[PDB]
Amino acid sequence: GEFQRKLYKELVKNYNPDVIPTQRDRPVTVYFSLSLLQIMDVDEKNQVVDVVFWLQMSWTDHYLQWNVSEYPGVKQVSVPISSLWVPDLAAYNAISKPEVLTPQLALVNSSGHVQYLPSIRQRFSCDVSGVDTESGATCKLKFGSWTHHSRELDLQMQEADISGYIPYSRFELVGVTQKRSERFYECCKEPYPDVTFTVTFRKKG
Amino acid sequence: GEFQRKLYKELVKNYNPDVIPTQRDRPVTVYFSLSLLQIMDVDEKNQVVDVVFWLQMSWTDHYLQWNVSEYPGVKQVSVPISSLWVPDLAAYNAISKPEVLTPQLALVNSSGHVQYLPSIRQRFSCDVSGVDTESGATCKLKFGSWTHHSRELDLQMQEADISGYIPYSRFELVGVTQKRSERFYECCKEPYPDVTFTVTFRKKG
Amino acid sequence: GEFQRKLYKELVKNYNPDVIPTQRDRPVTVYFSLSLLQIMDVDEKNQVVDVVFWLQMSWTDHYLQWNVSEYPGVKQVSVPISSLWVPDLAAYNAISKPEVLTPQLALVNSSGHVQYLPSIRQRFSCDVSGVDTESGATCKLKFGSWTHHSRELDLQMQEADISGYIPYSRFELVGVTQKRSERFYECCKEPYPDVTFTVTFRKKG
Amino acid sequence: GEFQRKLYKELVKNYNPDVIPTQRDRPVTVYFSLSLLQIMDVDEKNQVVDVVFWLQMSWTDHYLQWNVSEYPGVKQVSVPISSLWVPDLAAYNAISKPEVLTPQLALVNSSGHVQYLPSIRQRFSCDVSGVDTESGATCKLKFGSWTHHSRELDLQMQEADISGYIPYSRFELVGVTQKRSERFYECCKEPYPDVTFTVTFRKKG
Amino acid sequence: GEFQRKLYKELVKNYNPDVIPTQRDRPVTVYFSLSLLQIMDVDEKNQVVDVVFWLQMSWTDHYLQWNVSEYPGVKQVSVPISSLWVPDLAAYNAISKPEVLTPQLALVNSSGHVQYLPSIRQRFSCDVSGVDTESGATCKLKFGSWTHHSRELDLQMQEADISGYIPYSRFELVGVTQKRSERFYECCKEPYPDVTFTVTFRKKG
Numbered sequence A, B, C, D, E: 001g002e003f004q005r006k007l008y009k010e011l012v013k014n015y016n017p018d019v020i021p022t023q024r025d026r027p028v029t030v031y032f033s034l035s036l037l038q039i040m041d042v043d044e045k046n047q048v049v050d051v052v053f054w055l056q057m058s059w060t061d062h063y064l065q066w067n068v069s070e071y072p073g074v075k076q077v078s079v080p081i082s083s084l085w086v087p088d089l090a091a092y093n094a095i096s097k098p099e100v101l102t103p104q105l106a107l108v109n110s111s112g113h114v115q116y117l118p119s120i121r122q123r124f125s126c127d128v129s130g131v132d133t134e135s136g137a138t139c140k141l142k143f144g145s146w147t148h149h150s151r152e153l154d155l156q157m158q159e160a161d162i163s164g165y166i167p168y169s170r171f172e173l174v175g176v177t178q179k180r181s182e183r184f185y186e187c188c189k190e191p192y193p194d195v196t197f198t199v200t201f202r203k204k205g
């Protein structure tokens, strides 16, 4: 009943959504996956692919946990993302702002596990010259934290999902591979991880 | 009137718009209706339909009720939605953010029944290839709660309504059907209800 | 000025811009009129009219009144509309959000009379098929409150004027009318008024 | 700096950016000019001209004054326009919202003099029929206060400039004149001044 | 973590994001670099270039420093830019607002050194008529403080890296240069410094 009201109150107490919830030396592990829903368009002149996808981002926030016996019935809560820390993931080769298609809410259970599952439309730089060939065009969707390094934010992949690709598109989805990389940059002391989704596709016919 | 001014004070006191107003072992029943108003356009290359529709959502928020004898004359109030909990219904196959055309206000009576009735323009993914044939094209417009499952938010369909369809469109509205599904996901033990409106349309002539 | 600064400080006390300023039984009377400045475009395929127009809206807000001899020289003040109650008028057949072209300020005098005079661009659903005939096409621009009925918000017209219509347009005005009606809807026990501006126009040539 | 910081806390005190800083029998004088940077497009069908320009606006706000002696080093401060009163200048014949291209900051010196110099892109209603003729097309960009009459806000022209018109435009800028006018209305005892910029241009050929 | 949360509380105190962090007579030195990623389009009719680029900006804010011994583990934090001072760099000849592609977060180390690295899409006025020639077209990208002169904000370049220019563009990069300038405007006594990036490029094939 009102326990949920009571819980939101305590959870917001002394919480800062700008601050990554690392706990003494241990990085926040962030599990990450992309599912391709639709390739909306290609621009062969300007080298751009327009896509709709669903992101899966999940991690543990130790500040957002609670004893279930103090709030009977409350096993999970639905929370607007502006009120909690969320990973600052960025598409490295995007040429447009992401358009979030779904309500900006995350699910949080009693042990502090968070799930933010946004569906998103965004345009990306890509060489789409081969879209008209048997081998198709290959586009890399590269994602990573904009400002958090490996030892703060440990980005890891879950298995991706093409089962949600719409069948009636004018683009045939040949394949989708994903890989986690990590590199030191000529800029910073700590290394940064990234996850890249490579999608190959062609125009039917 | 003073009584409204006083009533607004009390309704915001101890009120959290992020908390679904469930009440002990009972979900919030959300009644849901869609009236198709106009099919704005069809993108036959990218498989997209652009529609304008009127949504009708209503539910009882038990934290928003008041004794009429205490606030005499005040039988209902008009409140901005940003100050109210609202169902987090997502348009599952939307490829654009919804453009809300009407004022973002809801009606609330003294037993906490809320009505929110936005008019919306939105683009959806759809196989429109059959639009210039007699059988026409069929688009599904699928909605459901993004983060609340069946035991928290009970989505209930109301009557199919095509009376608002403008008569001078270049698209003949053949039929609109609806179905309420309660589907499980490979993730959660609890199902998530969704309401699907199926509209069949074809180019006049 | 000092007196204007002192007046704001008084007027803002307890002011709630979400609460309609009715006074026991008495509705708030709202005067409304529209002047067409320009027909920007007609979309013959999708049945849409793009127009620029000037609304005149005025009403009395009784919490916004003051003794002029307590604030000598202060006869009217300029107030951002975000700070005051404004009628929740909607364009019933708009297919886009209204784009406001002018500063969002209302004039308020010492007897509580408020004037808000925005210039607005907005697109409407309209059968424009006969735009190239001598009879021309007719568009109805219908306006009314979205959540207030007759006994709370009494919409009235002030008379029209077409003298602001730009004369170098490619469209010629053939007829203009604006009437106030009062109709019932399936929802409510109470009637809701509206003002409708009916413009007939055609391509010159 | 340390004193700049302290000057802000003082200036914010009792300051109301909604109240025009008039005195008894002393309008706020607003100096105003326009520099045309480029004519982006002309729309001969819909009668629209698209322009990028630089406005200069300066006025004195006696509530922003300070003693340099009390704040040594601080001759001027850089302030967000949202923090202070600014003239509600409207473009009378604009068919679009002004796109502000520059940081929304004003310069304020110790005597209270505020300078605001935004770069703007905006579209205006205009008869561009003559754009291909030798006579050229003539457009009038008319600006004035939306809600303040002469006795509150005294609009004045400053000597304009076209040294900043880009020389590789496809449009040849022929001539630009300016004039301050003061006109009455049937509504108001007091007149409302405006500054109008007349520009004559033609396609280069 | 808990140290970091404590750290945020402290930096936020008395901190005014509107006040440039000058220290007695010392300007804030701001290092500035542009990395061209993609030329998206050219408009040979409207003389416009559309570009995606990566800006590197860095400066020290002495109000943002702490002792790592007081806050063990915390070497650097990531902070929303809206919550701290940032240079008011303007794109002088831009004809559109900047679309910021990346999270609006800056990095700050314990000595108060701030790094802000937004990726940005923006359109610029430019004579692109050389694009189809051996010499190609030359476009200038002129940036500088809008409201701070040389003695307040000291704009310095860093090397303009073009290792990020995508290879599959239809435009070939011929050369990029960078120059600092100081200009005196008929207004003030101090100079305003601008950094200009000059890019030469031509259509491939």
Ligand SMILES: *[C@@H]1O[C@H](CO)[C@@H](O[C@@H]2O[C@H](CO)[C@@H](O[C@H]3O[C@H](CO)[C@@H](O)[C@H](O[C@@H]4O[C@H](CO)[C@@H](O)[C@H](O)[C@@H]4O)[C@@H]3O)[C@H](O)[C@H]2NC(C)=O)[C@H](O)[C@H]1NC(C)=O
Binding pocket: B060, B109, B110, B111, B112, B113
């Ligand atoms: C605020 O708005 C809400 C939503 O419209 C109002 O809610 C409705 O109240 C109805 C009347 O109280 C209520 O009706 C029924 O409850 C049962 C149906 O599930 C049914 O048993 C009742 O029948 C009653 O039985 C007799 C015998 O026939 C009837 O003749 C009497 O009318 C009895 O009331 C009612 O039909 C309905 O369920 C409810 N709707 C929702 C969605 O909750 C609410 O009253 C408004 N508040 C106020 C104070 O006006």
Ligand SMILES: *[C@@H]1O[C@H](CO)[C@@H](O[C@@H]2O[C@H](CO)[C@@H](O)[C@H](O)[C@H]2NC(C)=O)[C@H](O)[C@H]1NC(C)=O
Binding pocket: A109, A110, A111, A112, A113
């Ligand atoms: C809260 O959510 C987490 C994350 O889903 C739940 O954890 C998983 O449970 C499965 C099934 O036993 C385990 O195999 C995994 O090891 C868990 N994942 C992680 C990341 O820890 C967890 O069960 C939930 N906690 C509560 C209190 O119910």
Ligand SMILES: *[C@@H]1O[C@H](CO)[C@@H](O[C@@H]2O[C@H](CO)[C@@H](O)[C@H](O)[C@H]2NC(C)=O)[C@H](O)[C@H]1NC(C)=O
Binding pocket: D109, D110, D111, D112, D113
């Ligand atoms: C603040 O700025 C105003 C505007 O520039 C200054 O007023 C000018 O002063 C100069 C001489 O210093 C005169 O020649 C101009 O006629 C003035 N202009 C206007 C519009 O009045 C003013 O001096 C500045 N204040 C301080 C403290 O220097």
Ligand SMILES: *[C@@H]1O[C@H](CO)[C@@H](O[C@@H]2O[C@H](CO)[C@@H](O)[C@H](O)[C@H]2NC(C)=O)[C@H](O)[C@H]1NC(C)=O
Binding pocket: E109, E110, E111, E113
């Ligand atoms: C905070 O960041 C700045 C910027 O990287 C660091 O400053 C530099 O130190 C290196 C060598 O130690 C020099 O090559 C740079 O020229 C320095 N930048 C200058 C001159 O400001 C600074 O050391 C960092 N602080 C901490 C605590 O690590």
Ligand SMILES: *[C@@H]1O[C@H](CO)[C@@H](O[C@H]2O[C@H](CO)[C@@H](O)[C@H](O)[C@H]2NC(C)=O)[C@H](O)[C@H]1NC(C)=O
Binding pocket: C060, C109, C110, C111, C112, C113
């Ligand atoms: C404030 O403005 C209102 C409207 O102009 C003034 O109005 C009322 O009186 C006028 C004639 O005396 C009428 O022309 C108005 O239509 C009428 N309006 C209403 C709704 O009552 C009013 O006098 C002004 N108040 C003061 C003190 O000047």
Ligand SMILES: CN1[C@@H](CC(=O)c2ccccc2)CCC[C@H]1C[C@H](O)c1ccccc1
Binding pocket: A092, A093, A144, A145, A146, A147, A185, A187, A188, A192, E054, E056, E115, E117, E119
């Ligand atoms: C942002 N950058 C690292 C930070 C950094 O380089 C940097 C840090 C500090 C100073 C100078 C540069 C952090 C991890 C992401 C990486 C991204 C890549 O650079 C990049 C830049 C522009 C477009 C696409 C990709």
Ligand SMILES: CN1[C@@H](CC(=O)c2ccccc2)CCC[C@H]1C[C@H](O)c1ccccc1
Binding pocket: A037, A054, A115, A117, A119, A164, B092, B093, B145, B146, B147, B185, B187, B188, B192
């Ligand atoms: C978001 N998802 C359910 C939650 C969930 O799946 C989920 C929860 C937790 C972990 C992993 C997945 C809640 C109800 C909606 C459903 C939506 C569907 O996925 C989906 C995603 C993208 C496009 C179309 C459909």
Ligand SMILES: CN1[C@@H](CC(=O)c2ccccc2)CCC[C@H]1C[C@H](O)c1ccccc1
Binding pocket: B054, B107, B115, B117, B119, C092, C093, C144, C145, C146, C147, C148, C185, C187, C188, C192
């Ligand atoms: C919004 N509606 C009335 C309110 C109401 O219906 C309503 C009220 C309470 C409960 C359920 C519905 C108020 C007056 C306007 C009317 C609008 C028209 O239907 C309409 C709907 C959709 C597009 C165009 C026009």
Ligand SMILES: CN1[C@@H](CC(=O)c2ccccc2)CCC[C@H]1C[C@H](O)c1ccccc1
Binding pocket: C054, C115, C117, C119, D092, D093, D144, D145, D146, D147, D185, D187, D188, D192
């Ligand atoms: C806003 N109006 C004056 C006020 C006023 O008229 C008015 C005031 C009160 C009642 C009725 C009308 C103030 C000075 C500007 C002027 C603008 C012009 O109307 C106008 C309207 C629409 C498009 C272009 C121009």
Ligand SMILES: CN1[C@@H](CC(=O)c2ccccc2)CCC[C@H]1C[C@H](O)c1ccccc1
Binding pocket: D054, D056, D115, D117, D119, E092, E093, E145, E146, E147, E185, E186, E187, E188, E192
């Ligand atoms: C704004 N201006 C300087 C100040 C100033 O000129 C000025 C100040 C006060 C009064 C009159 C003029 C400050 C530094 C930037 C410079 C910009 C340039 O004008 C400009 C304006 C519009 C487009 C391109 C360039």
Ligand SMILES: Cc1cccc(NC(=O)N2CCCC2)c1
Binding pocket: C003, C004, C005, C007, C008, C011, C012, C015, C077, C078, C079, C080, C083, C084, D018, D019, D020
């Ligand atoms: C003198 C003056 C200038 C500008 C505004 C006002 N009043 C207000 O902004 N209010 C907000 C709510 C009621 C009053 C006064």
